[PDB]
Design a protein around this nucleic acid. Structure first.
Lengths: 199, 190, 109, 176, 138, 247
RNA sequence: GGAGCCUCGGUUGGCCUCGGAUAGCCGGUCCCCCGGGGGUCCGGUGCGGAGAGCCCUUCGUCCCGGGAAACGGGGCGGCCGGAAAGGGGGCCGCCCUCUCGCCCGUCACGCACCGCACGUUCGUGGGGAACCUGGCGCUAAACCAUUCGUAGACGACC
């Protein structure tokens, strides 16, 4: 009942549009690995597009002015914020269904993350165009925790490789089971091939 | 328009034994091994022919710009062949009018100290690139030989010391000082 | 012993951009994402089930707190599976984004 | 004339109304490429009024028929001579295309003239359509398909139906 | 590196369009993104079809680059594409897909009872294989 | 219209929220970054401003006008009685910052440090850490303590120690000690932690932390001066004498 | 660690995870080379070791037969693995519990409430009072007043 999206390889605006619509339909969404998000256009172009955002602050009092968040998760969170009627109750009730993260926190490191192919860089961009990683862009504009979240994410990568290698051998026994049991489940597989489940 | 196909084969000699992992190419032979990536160039690299005597590059449906990249790869891989078969030798000359530019090398040919340049008290320290060995030649006074198998690392490290000795706020037409690249060849010939 | 209604979301009221017609609701039935597959749901009876504070009588049961607003799927909306529905009382705006059931019993099969 | 949809080729023949001075005026035939035959008749009078001193009020259409393709199952090379207008001055061009029908090649030209030169259909006067032999083509983008052993892959297969499983599990494959 | 090449005589399978699910043979290439294609023995009149609505398969049958449907039909029946196609694992999971779509509710019930018992005999088997690996380890 | 004659602005905005400090004791906003190459050592100490006085020394900077001459220099005396470690604390490294992982206090804490945990020592029953103290004479408790230390050997990145001053030795009026976290810069966390584990409940003289002729940073709260006008708070110009509403 | 009364609501089976490539991948055999990697070979690739997917599936009970199970199904103690925002996860024995559990078939019954709606859950849900009953526990601090002057317009602060 909770949609856990992986942010690696997604285009920022293309992903935010689909997340914003789902959230407005009472769907709880969790975008993970926000530093993996890509933005179209070369890196330097996107950096200047963000440095021009830092220069916009309330002249008389910057403490009231626009709050330029530097975490990739909060940069993506602000993008979705612009695609919602956040000045209303149903807009604010929507944003509470969204929950973004940098890296993969513990509640979701052991869950199968979905992927939105309609918002995926390998699909929506010509292979000759240049793009910018949100992680690197955020690091060079103030984000302080790129180095650590790189090491923490590296930990869970081999912690998942252990599980995966454990999972292949787990079902390698399964594929070895049928060819030991083929004589006593034959009357059950043909029923699954008659209706196209094993063919 | 879009050209249907543009290609270019690259003959490889027998002493070198090339192999490629997808769009990355590794080139092994006498003077060592070189490995270059091309995952940014978007072409088809097929190593055809038993005996593996030649390598072709392919580009289907390419416009004017991305057709220009089919030869740069053939130029790059050929430079990777020369570096493993003959290496790269860049000789640099120390041209000075009045102040002799004395040069000494540290860390077994990987760091160059340039003193007395223009009679300046500031010693110039340049770090070579990994895999490049610097040396002062013998039987010749002011030459600074550079060896290595990667043409990029050799030629860039040559431009490092070529830009590390520049004349500030003077008439560079009068002060023709510095270490300049003179000859670009190979460590051995056939 | 199981669920016998389709899942649908009260997307919003039939509206233009600066006018909304609260007498018609826009539904987003889960699973259907194109017009050519909405015709199964046309005419089906849909309900908005909610629970309130005071107890209400219940047909074939003793008073609980749950109430309903009955409606029916009138016609397809848009081009991507949404569908219009008309209820005996205009749906309350606090239902935007909540579950309403799409039963099957006005069935045509 | 809006180049709406796929154009069709019409054979329109017309003449001046008979006067007591000239009992039977000569007939005038044109090949008009138009969406429907109603705009073909108007586009016919546009050209006749330019070459002759004739108008719709002094003339009549003696036959408005559509001409069909004599070989809609053979790839052909078409040469087209245009007279389009730019923001500054007018130009004659000779464009080549490669289609199955003359009407399909002409509509292929209006879209291409609209894309390359931002020329809208009302500023183009297509003047001659000749289906040329492959040896006599000039433009190279057409000449590269004259190969008895043409062969190429479809390298980067852009994913279509990218919204059917809007939230899928596996990453899509772009290699087949 | 590529294996499937759009060339004269390559059998392709149409993804979408009014002919979705039919084989067809490429006889000519009109322009870059549109080919003149023809399936004579697959109820597909010779026509121009874009390269989108086709998935080129691993079957090449030879004939001149513009031969009329008569010669395409003979080369199609010479290679016997219709039977060779039905033997590929591609076609077999195509026809196994609508078999799961035409599944009647009762057939959907008979599956539920066959799947249930089948998975039981599988899971207790691998259960007996893990306990067969732990005394193997010591 | 622009300003006729340029002038640099008055006061820095880098110190801008000129408000009463929320703390009375100086807070170390940042400790020196550590490297496992060096031996373990504390990185801060806690002293009390006594006063000022002269000094006479012979400067030894060559090439200066004052080389090999004697100078008078104003020095500040800071009375620093030794501190006592009363606990350690670990910090895990998170993408949200530095989260405190686990705190472990010493078995027997001095009353002067227990003063810190109360707003009214006279009214209190002085019960702080009384049930915590019972975790060192039962095996079940001690078998939990090492499981806390072993856990900090695995997950903690930076390790600080809780030390406090000894108010009894000072001529000051108050007796409530000052607690503080002093980061331990040094070797690996393992050897970093066991060094503090044995320094627990021990004295730490200032001679262990600093040496002579060493550059250090001083962190404290400025001498307060109350409500002040712009002329004293920012040093602007006094308006001329003829001004009506005040100058 | 038991029953009831208010109140706030939404929901109406689960997916417990490789990393990533996209002009390439996935799974195996390891005959091969070093402390898991590399290389090789064999299979798949409009992904079927497929999210176009998988899992679980419940009308209930009583007998009897067949297939499947015997290592299984169900119960109290320890054992560790888990730290980015840490599970009632797995492992040992336990006295008792069954060939009952699933798949085919036999027999019998379970208000058959007489065509009709909020049914079917997550639900020992959240929050709140008042009773149950035992076992185990636990006996503080803040603020004022007073004082200080490292503070101070008053509060605050030490």
């Amino acid at each position: 009942q909770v949609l856990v999206l992986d942010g690696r390889g997604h285009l920022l605006g293309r992903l935010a549009a689909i997340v914003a619509k789902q959230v407005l339909l009472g769907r709880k969404v969790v975008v993970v690995r926000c530093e993996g998000i890509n933005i179209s256009g070369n890196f330097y172009r996107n950096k200047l597009k963000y440095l021009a955002f830092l220069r916009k602050r309330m002249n008389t009092n910057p403490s009231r002015g626009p709050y330029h968040f530097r975490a990739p998760s909060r940069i993506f969170w602000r993008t979705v914020r612009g695609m919602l009627p956040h000045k209303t109750k149903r807009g604010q009730a929507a944003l509470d269904r969204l929950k973004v993260f940098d890296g993969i926190p513990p509640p979701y490191d052991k869950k199968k993350r979905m992927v939105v192919p309609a918002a995926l860089k390998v699909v929506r961009l010509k292979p000759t165009r240049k793009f910018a990683y949100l992680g690197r862009l955020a690091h060079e504009v103030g984000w302080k925790y790129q180095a650590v979240t790189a090491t923490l994410e590296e930990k869970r990568k081999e912690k998942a490789k252990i599980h995966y290698r454990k999972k292949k051998q787990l079902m390698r026994l399964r594929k070895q089971a049928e060819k030991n049991v083929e004589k006593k489940i034959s009357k059950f597989t043909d029923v699954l091939k008659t209706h196209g489940l094993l063919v | 328009m879009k050209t249907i196909l543009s290609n270019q084969t690259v003959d490889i000699p027998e002493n070198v034994d090339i192999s490629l992992k997808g769009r990355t190419v590794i080139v092994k032979g006498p003077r060592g091994t070189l490995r270059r990536d091309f995952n940014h160039i978007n072409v088809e690299l097929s190593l055809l022919g038993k005996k593996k005597k030649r390598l072709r590059v392919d580009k289907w449906w390419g416009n004017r710009k991305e057709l220009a990249t089919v030869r740069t790869i053939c130029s790059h891989v050929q430079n990777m062949i020369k570096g493993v078969t003959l290496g790269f030798r860049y000789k640099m000359r120390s041209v000075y009018a009045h102040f002799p530019i004395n040069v000494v090398i540290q860390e077994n040919g990987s760091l160059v100290e340039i003193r007395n340049f223009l009679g300046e008290k500031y010693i110039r320290r340049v770090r070579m690139r990994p895999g490049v060995a610097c040396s002062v030649s013998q039987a010749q006074k002011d030459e600074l030989v550079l060896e290595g198998n990667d043409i990029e690392l050799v030629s860039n490290s040559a431009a490092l010391i070529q830009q590390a000795t520049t004349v500030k706020n003077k008439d560079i037409r009068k002060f023709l000082d510095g270490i300049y690249v003179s000859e670009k060849g190979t460590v051995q010939q056939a | 012993s199981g669920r016998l209604w389709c899942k649908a979301i009260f997307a919003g009221y039939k509206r233009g951009l600066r006018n909304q017609r609260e007498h018609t609701a826009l539904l987003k039935i889960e699973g259907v994402y194109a017009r050519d597959e909405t015709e199964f749901y046309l005419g089906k009876r849909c309900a908005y089930v909610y629970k309130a504070k005071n107890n209400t009588v219940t047909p074939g049961g003793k008073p609980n707190k749950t109430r309903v607003i009955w409606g029916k799927v009138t016609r397809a909306h848009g081009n991507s599976g949404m569908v219009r529905a008309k209820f005996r009382s205009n749906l309350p705006a606090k239902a935007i984004g909540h579950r309403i059931r799409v039963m099957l019993y006005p069935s045509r099969i | 004339m809006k180049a709406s949809g796929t154009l069709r080729e019409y054979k329109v023949v017309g003449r001046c109304l008979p006067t007591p001075k000239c009992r039977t005026p000569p007939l005038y035939r044109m090949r008009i490429f138009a969406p429907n035959h109603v705009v073909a008749k108007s586009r016919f009078w546009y050209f006749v009024s330019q070459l002759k001193k004739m108008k719709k009020s002094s003339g009549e259409i003696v036959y408005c028929g559509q001409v069909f393709e004599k070989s809609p199952l053979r790839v052909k090379n078409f040469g087209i001579w245009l007279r389009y207008d730019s923001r500054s001055g007018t130009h004659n061009m000779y464009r080549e295309y490669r289609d199955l029908t003359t009407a399909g090649a002409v509509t292929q030209c209006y879209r291409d003239m609209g894309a390359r030169h931002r020329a809208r259909a009302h500023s183009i006067q297509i003047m001659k359509v000749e289906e040329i032999a492959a040896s006599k083509c000039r433009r190279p983008a057409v000449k590269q398909f004259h190969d008895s052993k043409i062969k190429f892959p479809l390298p980067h297969r852009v994913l279509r139906r990218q919204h059917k499983p809007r939230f899928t599990t596996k990453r899509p494959n772009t290699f087949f | 590196v590529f294996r499937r090449f759009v060339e004269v005589g390559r059998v392709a399978y149409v993804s979408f369009g009014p002919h979705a699910g039919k084989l067809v043979a490429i006889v000519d290439v009109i322009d870059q993104n549109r080919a003149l294609v023809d399936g004579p023995c697959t109820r597909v009149r010779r026509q121009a079809m874009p390269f989108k609505c086709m998935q080129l398969t691993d079957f090449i049958l030879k004939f001149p680059h513009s031969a009329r449907q008569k010669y395409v039909r003979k080369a199609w029946e010479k290679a016997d594409i219709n039977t060779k196609w039905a033997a590929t694992r591609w076609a077999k999971k195509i026809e196994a897909r609508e078999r799961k779509a035409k599944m009647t509710d009762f057939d959907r019930y008979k599956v539920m009872k066959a799947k249930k018992m089948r998975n039981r005999i599988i899971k207790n088997e691998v259960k007996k294989l893990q306990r067969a690996a732990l005394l193997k380890a010591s | 219209s622009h300003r006729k004659f340029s002038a640099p602005r008055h006061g820095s905005l880098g110190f801008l929220p000129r408000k009463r400090s929320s703390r009375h004791r100086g807070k170390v906003k940042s400790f020196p970054k550590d490297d496992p190459s060096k031996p373990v050592h504390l990185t801060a100490f806690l002293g009390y401003k006594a006063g000022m006085t002269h000094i006479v020394r012979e400067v030894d900077r060559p090439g200066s006008k004052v080389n090999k001459k004697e100078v008078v220099e104003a020095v500040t005396i800071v009375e620093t009685p030794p501190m006592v470690v009363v606990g350690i604390v670990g910090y895990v490294e998170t993408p949200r910052g530095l989260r405190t992982f686990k705190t472990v206090f010493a078995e027997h804490i001095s009353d002067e440090c227990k003063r810190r945990f109360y707003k009214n020592w006279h009214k209190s029953k002085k019960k702080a850490f009384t049930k915590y103290c019972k975790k060192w004479q039962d095996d079940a408790g001690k078998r939990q303590l090492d499981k806390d230390f072993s856990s900090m050997k695995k997950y903690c990145q930076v390790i600080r120690v809780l030390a406090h001053t000894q108010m009894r030795l000072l001529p000051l009026r108050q007796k409530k000690a000052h607690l503080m976290e002093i980061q331990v810069n040094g070797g690996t966390v393992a050897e970093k932690l066991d060094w503090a584990r044995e320094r627990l409940e021990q004295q730490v003289p200032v001679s262990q932390v600093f040496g002579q002729d060493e550059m250090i940073d001083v962190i404290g709260v400025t001498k307060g001066k109350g409500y002040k006008g712009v002329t004293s708070r920012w040093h602007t110009k006094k308006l001329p004498r003829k001004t009506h509403r005040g100058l």
